[PDB]
Amino acid sequence: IAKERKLLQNKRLDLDAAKTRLKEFDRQAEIT
Amino acid sequence: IAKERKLLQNKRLDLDAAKTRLKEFDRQAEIT
Incomplete structure (x- = not known):
């Protein structure tokens, strides 16, 4: 859980x- | 074109x- x-x-x-600099959050957020 | x-x-x-580390290529590839 800590990892x-x-x-x-x-x-x-x-x-x-x-996403700010215009011109793997999802899997890590899912397991967390 | 070089940029x-x-x-x-x-x-x-x-x-x-x-995509390798499981558990903006598209727009840049499109303009290139």
């Missing part, structure tokens, strides 16, 4: 930095 | 590293 939430807190900022 | 293929060669490895 999956630790990787969720890693991949949430990756999703946010991906 | 779009340079960003395609950046985002293809991002798609591959996203």
